[PDB]
Design a protein around this ligand. Structure first.
Ligand code: VN3
Length: 148
């Protein structure tokens, strides 16, 4: 049994909506690290709630319905990879589990598997229909595709 809102895009990495504080114990049973993409005002609890449960945080705030830069994306991907190499499972989350986190998940499959944007987008949207919500989110993935 695993937290049922985790949408796995490979064996070790998943994306999701925001976990409530009362869900963190269950999340922490399977995930060692979390990439938090919401801005501080969106958090209903301190990010220390993750750390105290043994879940290492990368806070990479992106305003809702906007896109990270390609440079930010590459930083997040290396951080995920570092933890996957240690045998850890990693969760990526935003608020809805669709746009910000879907964008990072697409980027992750491109980076980790060499998938085309099309292939990676199809797989992420099979896990969460509607993932990658805005034009600018699509554009930064095209920009990333050119560079990896
Ligand atoms: O809070 V999300 O960009 O689905």
């Amino acid at each position: 049994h695993m937290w049922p809102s985790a949408k796995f895009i490979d064996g070790r990495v998943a994306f999701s909506r925001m976990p409530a504080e009362r869900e963190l114990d269950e999340v922490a049973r399977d995930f060692d690290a979390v990439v938090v993409l919401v801005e501080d005002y969106e958090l209903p609890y301190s990010l220390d709630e993750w750390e105290k449960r043994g879940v290492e945080v990368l806070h990479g705030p992106i305003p809702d319905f906007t896109a990270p830069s390609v440079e930010q994306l590459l930083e997040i991907l290396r951080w995920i990879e570092e933890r996957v190499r240690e045998g850890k499972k990693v969760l990526i989350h935003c608020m809805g589990g669709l746009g910000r986190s879907g964008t990072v998940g697409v980027a992750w499959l491109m980076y980790s598997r060499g998938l085309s944007l099309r292939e990676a987008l199809m797989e992420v949207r099979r896990k969460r229909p509607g993932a990658v919500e805005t034009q600018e989110q699509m554009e930064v993935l095209k920009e990333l595709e050119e560079r990896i």
